[PDB]
Every structure is written in C-alpha cells, then in structure tokens.
Amino acid sequence: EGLNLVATALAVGLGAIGPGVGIGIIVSGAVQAIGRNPEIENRVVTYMFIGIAFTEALAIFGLVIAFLIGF
C-alpha cells in the first residue's frame, strides 16, 4: 500500500517536530543575552548561528531521508 508515502510523511513530521523548537529557544536565549550584554555581541551571535546550523542539520538529514524514500 502507501507504506512508503506514510513512512516519508511520518519521518518528515517527526524529524521537524522540535529541532526548530530548540532553535527558537536558543534564539530567545540569545536575545536575552544580547539584551544583557549588547557590548558583548556578534560573537555570541556567531555561536548562535553555529548552533542554528547544528540544529538545522537534523532537519536537513530528515529531508534527505524523505527524499531518498521518494527515490
């Protein structure tokens, strides 16, 4: 049946089910830190961008798995 479609759908939905949430939490914490130390910025923001890339790596892997399922 539609087992491949169901699998790809569930994989995408569950993979994208909080990595973004963690990214938003990191963003909020970075916003709090920037409000705390506006002078100390753009390096904490750099680490924030690095962490954003690290979090988005999971979504990229999930999307790649879904595409491979589609292939």
Amino acid at 18: G
Q: Write the binding mask 1 to 30 for its own copies: x where contact by CB under 8 A, - elsewhere.
A: xxxxxxxxxxxxxxxxxxxxxxxxxxxxxx
Shortest separation between residue 69's beta carbon and another protein, angstroms? 11
Tell me the DSSP string of 25-45: HHHHHHHHHHHH-SSS-SSHH
> How far is the C-alpha of 6 from the C-alpha of 14, rounded, in Å?
12
Of residues 10-39, those binding another protein (CB under 8 A): none
Site for another protein in 41-60 (CB under 8 A): 42-43, 45-46, 49-50, 52-54, 56-57, 59-60
Given a contact cutoff of 8 angstroms between Cβ atoms, the answer to whether 20 and 26 are in contact is: no
Residues in contact with its own copies by the rule CB under 8 A: 1-41, 43-45, 47-48, 50-52, 54-59, 61-63, 65-66, 68-70
